[PDB]
């Protein structure tokens, strides 16, 4: 099924970890798991409902990393007048996505903050 | 230049005006269009213009204790957020968003120069840009 500690849903194995890491450290932690894994992704409402069902005993309420980083990077940015975005003057900040251990809603956070996370792999 | 309308300030081939009225980004764009010829929320295409727009705003005293000032930057977009794949490499299908930061603004704390993505439905002062005519 799934090794010890891991839960099964829809052909995949999931594990929460309640120990605060930044987004980048979290992703690599998952990577370096005995079964190589990634930050949990959501492909459906039902899967999100299942993962918060998992989180709730374990991780309540901590903010929990999901697998989305640099969420405001590759937007198709354009001037309203239709002039070229040639000169560029951005800030200096990277946002990543998380949810509370208790609800399905997502929250944009500075990637360098520290919370908890869930790993996921295909079985 | 000088061939600007009253209320408008020249700089380099364009006329500019900061309006202290607080509008959502969209309301600001529409307001600018309606100060026709073809006026739009400002585009910043250079260091000199950034410096100019920044000086224009600082100069407006009614502006005001104001955190943000809309400019004409908006993402196109199209999804609810811009990261097109999860870290596992799969594409972003289901999305669960919530206010989103898909419009660009200048910020008080950053000297009205550096650009900040910010929530489009937030009401703020804005700068329009126009081609003399």
């Amino acid at each position: 099924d799934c090794p010890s500690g891991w839960s099964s849903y829809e052909g995949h194995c999931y594990k929460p970890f309640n120990e605060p890491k930044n987004w980048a450290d979290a992703e690599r932690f998952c990577k370096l798991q005995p079964k190589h894994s990634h930050l949990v992704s959501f492909q459906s409402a039902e899967e999100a409902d299942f993962v918060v069902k998992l989180t709730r005993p374990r991780l309540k309420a901590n903010l929990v990393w999901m697998g989305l980083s640099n969420i405001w990077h590759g937007c198709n940015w354009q001037w309203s007048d239709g002039a070229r975005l040639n000169y560029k003057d951005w800030q200096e900040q990277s946002e990543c996505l998380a949810f509370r251990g208790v609800h399905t809603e997502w929250l944009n956070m500075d990637c360098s903050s520290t919370c908890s996370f869930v790993c996921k792999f295909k079985a | 230049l000088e061939d600007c309308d009253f209320g408008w300030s020249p700089y380099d081939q364009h006329c500019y005006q900061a309006f202290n009225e607080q509008k959502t980004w969209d309301e600001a764009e529409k307001f600018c269009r309606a100060q026709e010829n073809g006026a739009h929320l400002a585009s910043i295409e250079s260091n000199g213009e950034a410096d100019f727009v920044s000086w224009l705003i600082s100069q407006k005293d009614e502006l005001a204790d104001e955190d943000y000032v809309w400019i004409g930057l908006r993402a196109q977009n199209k999804e609810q957020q811009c990261s097109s794949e999860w870290s596992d490499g799969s594409s972003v299908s289901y999305e669960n968003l919530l206010h989103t930061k898909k419009c660009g603004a200048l910020e008080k704390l950053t000297g009205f120069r550096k650009w900040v993505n910010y929530y489009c439905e937030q009401m703020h002062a804005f700068v329009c840009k126009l081609l003399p005519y």
């Binding site: - | 230049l1 061939d3 081939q13």
Partner: protein, 122 residues
Amino acid sequence: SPCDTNWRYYGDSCYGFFRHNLTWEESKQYCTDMNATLLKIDNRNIVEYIKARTHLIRWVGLSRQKSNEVWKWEDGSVISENMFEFLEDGKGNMNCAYFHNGKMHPTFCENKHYLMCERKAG
């Protein structure tokens, strides 16, 4: 210094820029209504000042009293030889000139453009 509201001082002259869309002759009339003259441009130096000041098409005081004759300023003087470099192509029946972005262009006198006037600083 010696100039008034809406008139800019340069050299020994006061210059006024007016966004009234008028024919060449109507513009001439507008200027003398203010005891002024449509602009004379007889050197490169004034070229650069004017193009600094505006980038919109504006009539200047250069015209040829009949088609295919010599180009003359308001004061009746003929455009200096050095200034031909700044006078662009035209047709024989284009008798009046406007200034735009550092060049003078011959065009139909009955067309409408913005204008500028000049007075001696006093």
